Design an enzyme around this catalytic site. Structure first.
Site, PDB file in Angstrom:
ATOM      1  N   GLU A 164       0.843  -1.077  -0.158  1.00 10.34           N
ATOM      2  CA  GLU A 164       0.061   0.179   0.155  1.00 10.34           C
ATOM      3  C   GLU A 164       0.793   1.313  -0.010  1.00 10.34           C
ATOM      4  O   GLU A 164       0.400   2.137  -0.679  1.00 10.34           O
ATOM      5  CB  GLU A 164      -1.147  -0.006   1.373  1.00 10.34           C
ATOM      6  N   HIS A 165       2.069   1.283   0.598  1.00  4.71           N
ATOM      7  CA  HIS A 165       2.917   2.501   0.659  1.00  4.71           C
ATOM      8  C   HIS A 165       3.534   2.474  -1.003  1.00  4.71           C
ATOM      9  O   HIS A 165       3.808   3.469  -1.357  1.00  4.71           O
ATOM     10  CB  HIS A 165       3.973   2.390   1.772  1.00  4.71           C
TER      11      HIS A 165
ATOM     12  N   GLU B 172       7.140   5.457  11.198  1.00  2.24           N
ATOM     13  CA  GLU B 172       5.766   5.465  11.480  1.00  2.24           C
ATOM     14  C   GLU B 172       5.544   4.683  12.835  1.00  2.24           C
ATOM     15  O   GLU B 172       4.827   5.069  13.711  1.00  2.24           O
ATOM     16  CB  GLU B 172       5.062   5.323  10.340  1.00  2.24           C
TER      17      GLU B 172
END
Lengths: 401, 98, 48, 44, 413, 24
Positions: free
Chosen positions: A51-52, A128
């Site tokens: 997804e990144h 993150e």
């Protein structure tokens, strides 16, 4: 008078669903039945890291030129991943409908994962996560999932453990991509100013290449005591019914009845024939036990004694909230994608209204006694949680003498 | 009836301690909510009047006759504020009843 | 058996009710049984 | 009192049951021997 | 059909659209923002915004809460520096009592002193929750340093004014700014007639034009507040056009050329963002235009150390746009981004109701989405350049926060 | 962070599920 959601199917199995409306901007998305539940602890962060990587360039559109295209029409590009579903959606104008679909086609197939990018996105993801711990409610809900679904693929988080994040390679990703991105497990959903025939022709033109190929609720508790935090977050849940079980609607009405702690939120998270139904509250240490007592009484009350009027309140409350039509395009489609992935069809709002109006007080307390009364909960606490009661007191508060 | 009410006001005897009628109300939940909604000056006069009446009852004295509270003069200050408390209270009760 | 739990234990009151009834009968059995056991134990040495 | 009415109904059975439990216990503890007598069991 | 806008003889604007939506929304828009206070009643609009559920003359508080939650409807208050908007929404079968509640709240408040004394602690809590993020504090600081009197007033109540706002100040503010000539009642999913008929039961009490607000005066100035956040949130703005002036649009095209936030869930998405780059930093263009004055500038979040040259780099990029260094394809992409943002802003129901509302109070007229599209198109390349030079020259106002040891000043910037 | 580890294996303790819920 709400327009119906029309669903077609390509040979690939990619159901192309659309719900036209006057609004001239549309939300076209791809949903995929692929999440952390389909990962096998050796690729626990593959969906998140893909997804990144999915917006960092494809084979046909190498690098930032791709996102230059989605800047050129002024469109917005979003993606998210849950434990069961992955979504890539674009909000754009109506007249830019073809190229957007073509863009989405690249994002699902022909995507390019650059090794250079892999290291950069690893540092992004790693960092993150290294700071994600900051968000308490996310920590508490991850703890609740882990202690409620111990030993199953539903305990593991969407992000995965830092370990896997560091230890991931193109080929692994390629696998997850080539394994969990099958055409029969994909929905192309469109909401707003779109024509269904034009969208079907665009799905036939591009995206017609996509290849065609239980859980156990461990009632238990996890408590991360850290007394330096100013506030405590506590989530208590029981096992939910699942997506296809209609008494979910009744349970939603029960949540609408509940709606002492600074923040009190009720949730009914549903996965494929399972789920978590409960409450999360964030409180000062010296109040925690009283909150819990309060909360258990309410639940027990509904299971024990619930009037007609409050039910009406919930019915109505849910109705307005359930109302999503023309709430937003992004929401609208999100609903089309989730409905085609979970139910296999788009449930119209009239059927939702019928299932709401058939709910009365007797079946609400029956279903609440079925799901709340004398059940073993999963408890997840984070913060100054010493006055949070242990499992016998909560389990004894799960029934009345 | 007016003269007999003045005679009963003299026979009740809280005017001899300098009290008002609304000072003599028993502080239930509604009365305490009405007292909490009073302005600061009225609340301070009420607390001073109650303290002076308690001091006079301690010494078993009364005020001089010129300092008593004239029936005509007594002001029902808490009354307006109280009605509301009762009204609100009843409304809430009714809602629950229904 | 789920039936037991669903019918006898689910409702706290029934949980008590069953206990109550059980108590009402336990005495009879236990008393008589123990009595006889005792009687047998001391089969010959008694008043009779 | 409609709300009270509904809640009452909900508690009626359990309430009665608790009462029933007490009654049963009463007879057993007291060894009524009159209610119990008709009962199959016999003290003697 | 489309919206209908009767102007009543007492000045009240009525706008309606019947689209047969299942949930209908009804809002009421007043020109009573925080710009209409002065130094004696600061923070009164914040307590007025938080005092929407207080016992009204017509309805007791219990009912105004239990009746809205009984039908599951929603009552919300949104406030800018110019405008306040009270919005209710719910099922079509309950919007009669929803209009009863909303029009009672707008027209006939009581403002009991014990209720506002209970509300001041909620005022403090709401201010703390709002200033939990750095952007809100830096925009409030930027407005305070940019303007002198009117638009410099904060949206949130100052710390000393808590405990000092009285019932008389709220009554004076309502009696001086909640008049019919400053109000528009806008309803999506309702018949125009009823709105007209609910505009007579209320909205007839105050027919004045209200106590107009002083003209906002620019002051300039740079304020820097060391707060510790590793990130130096810095906003540098200058005076720009008012909402109405054509120049306005040009400034909207200029922020969409420079970058108006990311469009992806994060690079080469802005001339600013492009202008070298080896660090984590966010840079966007800020534009806030009100009916007499506007602020346009740059907004930067960055690591304290690089805070300087990053700001300089962003400033230099705007200077390039002030020198004519731009391409027509970039301006066309900026126009497409701006018009797509406008259409997605009006695609939702509450955004549509707000837009109609704003247009009503602002120009008394409804501008079809289409009309706007051609006006944005009117903006042309030179126009954009022009607005830029306005920013590049006009006195700047700077609000900075964080570890400001390497954050430059205005005379250095 | 939180994801670093999983609930330790209680299997050793775990017994041999609503079907069994009432039973248990």
């Amino acid at each position: 008078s709400v327009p119906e959601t029309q669903v077609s199917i390509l040979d690939n199995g990619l159901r192309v669903a659309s719900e036209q409306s006057s609004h001239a901007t549309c939300t076209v998305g791809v949903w995929i039945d692929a999440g952390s539940r389909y990962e096998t602890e050796k690729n626990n962060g593959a969906g998140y890291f893909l997804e990144h990587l999915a917006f960092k360039g494809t084979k046909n559109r190498p690098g930032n030129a791709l996102e230059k295209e989605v800047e050129s029409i002024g469109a917005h590009l979003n993606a998210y991943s849950t434990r069961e579903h992955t979504a890539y959606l674009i909000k754009a104008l109506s007249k830019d409908l073809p190229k957007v679909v073509e863009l989405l086609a690249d994002i699902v197939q022909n995507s390019s994962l650059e090794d250079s990018q892999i290291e950069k996105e690893r540092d992004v993801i790693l960092r993150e996560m290294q700071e994600n711990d900051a968000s308490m409610q996310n920590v508490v809900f991850d703890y609740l999932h882990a202690t409620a679904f111990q030993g199953t693929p539903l305990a593991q988080a969407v992000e995965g453990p830092s370990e896997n994040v560091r230890r991931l390679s193109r080929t692994d990703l390629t696998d997850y991509l080539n394994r969990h991105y099958k055409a029969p497990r994909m929905v192309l959903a469109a909401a707003g100013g779109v024509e269904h025939q034009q969208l079907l022709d665009l799905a036939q033109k591009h995206l017609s290449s996509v290849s065609r190929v239980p859980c156990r609720f461990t009632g238990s508790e996890i408590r991360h005591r850290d007394d330096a935090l100013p506030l405590a977050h506590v989530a208590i849940a029981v096992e939910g019914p699942g997506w296809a079980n209609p008494d979910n609607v009744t349970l939603q009405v029960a949540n609408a009845i509940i709606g002492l702690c600074q923040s009190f939120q009720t949730f009914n998270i549903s996965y494929s024939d399972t789920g978590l139904l409960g409450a999360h509250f964030v409180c000062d240490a010296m109040s925690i036990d009283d909150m819990v007592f309060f909360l258990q009484g309410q639940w027990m009350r509904l299971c024990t004694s619930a009037t007609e009027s409050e039910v009406t309140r919930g019915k109505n409350i849910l109705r307005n909230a359930l109302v999503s039509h023309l709430d937003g395009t992004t929401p609208v489609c999100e609903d089309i994608g989730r409905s085609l992935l979970t139910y296999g069809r788009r449930i119209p709002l009239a059927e939702w209204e019928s299932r709401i109006q058939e709910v009365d007080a007797q079946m609400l307390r029956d279903i609440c006694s079925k799901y709340f009364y004398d059940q073993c909960p999963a408890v997840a606490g984070y913060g100054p949680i010493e006055q949070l009661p242990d499992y016998n007191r909560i389990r004894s508060g799960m029934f009345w003498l | 009836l007016d003269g007999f009410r003045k005679w009963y006001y003299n026979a009740a005897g809280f005017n001899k301690l300098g009290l008002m009628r609304d000072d003599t109300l028993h502080e239930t939940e509604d009365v305490k909510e009405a007292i909490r909604r009073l302005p600061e000056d009225l609340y301070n006069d009420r607390m001073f009047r109650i303290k002076r009446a308690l001091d006079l009852t301690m010494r078993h004295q009364i005020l001089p006759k010129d300092q008593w509270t004239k029936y005509e003069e007594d002001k029902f200050y808490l009354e307006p504020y109280l009605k509301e408390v009762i009204r609100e209270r009843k409304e809430r009760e009714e809602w629950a009843k229904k | 058996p789920s039936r037991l739990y669903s019918l006898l234990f689910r409702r706290t009151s029934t949980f008590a009710l069953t206990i109550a009834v059980g108590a009402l009968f336990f005495e009879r059995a236990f008393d008589q049984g123990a009595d006889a056991i005792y009687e047998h134990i001391n089969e010959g040495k008694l008043w009779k | 009192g409609p709300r009270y009415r509904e809640l009452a109904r909900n508690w009626i059975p359990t309430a009665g049951m608790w009462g029933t439990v007490g009654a049963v216990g009463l007879v057993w503890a007291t060894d009524w021997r009159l209610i119990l007598d008709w009962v199959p069991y016999i003290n003697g | 059909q489309d919206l209908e806008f009767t102007k009543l003889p007492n000045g009240l604007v009525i706008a309606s659209l019947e689209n047969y939506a299942p949930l209908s929304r009804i809002g009421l828009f007043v020109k009573a923002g925080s710009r209409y206070e002065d130094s004696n009643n600061l923070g009164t609009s914040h307590l007025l915004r938080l005092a929407s559920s207080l016992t009204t003359k017509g309805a007791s508080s219990f009912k105004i809460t239990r009746g809205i939650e009984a039908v599951g409807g929603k009552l919300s208050v949104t406030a800018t520096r110019e405008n306040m908007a009270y919005t209710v929404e719910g099922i079509r079968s309950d919007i009669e009592i929803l209009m009863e509640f909303l029009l009672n709240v707008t027209t006939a408040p009581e403002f009991r002193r014990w209720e506002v004394a209970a509300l001041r602690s909620q005022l403090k809590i709401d201010k703390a929750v709002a200033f939990q993020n750095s952007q809100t504090r830096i925009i409030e600081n930027l407005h305070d340093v940019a303007y002198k009197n009117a638009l410099a007033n904060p949206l949130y109540c100052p710390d000393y004014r808590m405990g000092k706002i009285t019932s008389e100040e709220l009554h004076y503010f309502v009696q001086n700014h909640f008049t019919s000539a400053r109000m528009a009642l806008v309803g999506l999913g309702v018949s125009h007639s009823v709105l007209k008929q609910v505009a007579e039961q209320f909205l007839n009490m105050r027919g004045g034009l209200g106590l107009a607000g002083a003209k906002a005066k620019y002051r300039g100035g740079e304020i820097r507040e060391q707060n510790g956040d590793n990130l130096v949130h810095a906003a540098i703005v200058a005076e720009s056009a008012a909402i109405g002036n054509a120049e306005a649009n040009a400034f909207s095209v200029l922020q969409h050329l420079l970058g108006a936030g990311p469009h992806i869930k994060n690079n080469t998405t802005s001339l600013l963002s492009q202008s070298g780059s080896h660090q984590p930093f966010d840079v966007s263009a800020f534009n806030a235009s009100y009916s007499d004055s506007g602020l346009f500038g740059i907004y930067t979040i960055s690591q304290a150390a690089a805070a300087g040259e990053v700001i300089n780099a962003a400033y230099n990029q705007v200077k390039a746009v002030a020198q004519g260094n731009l391409s027509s394809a970039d301006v066309q992409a900026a126009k497409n981004k701006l018009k797509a943002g406008y259409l997605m802003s009006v695609e939702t129901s509450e955004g549509f109701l707000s837009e109609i509302g704003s247009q009503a109070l602002a120009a008394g007229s409804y501008m079809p989405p289409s009309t706007v599209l051609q006006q944005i198109d009117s903006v042309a390349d030179a126009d954009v350049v022009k607005a830029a030079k306005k920013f590049v020259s006009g006195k700047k106002s700077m609000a900075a926060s964080g570890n400001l040891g390497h954050t430059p000043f205005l005379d250095e910037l | 962070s939180h994801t670093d580890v999983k609930v330790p294996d209680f299997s050793d303790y775990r017994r041999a599920s609503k079907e069994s819920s009432e039973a248990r």
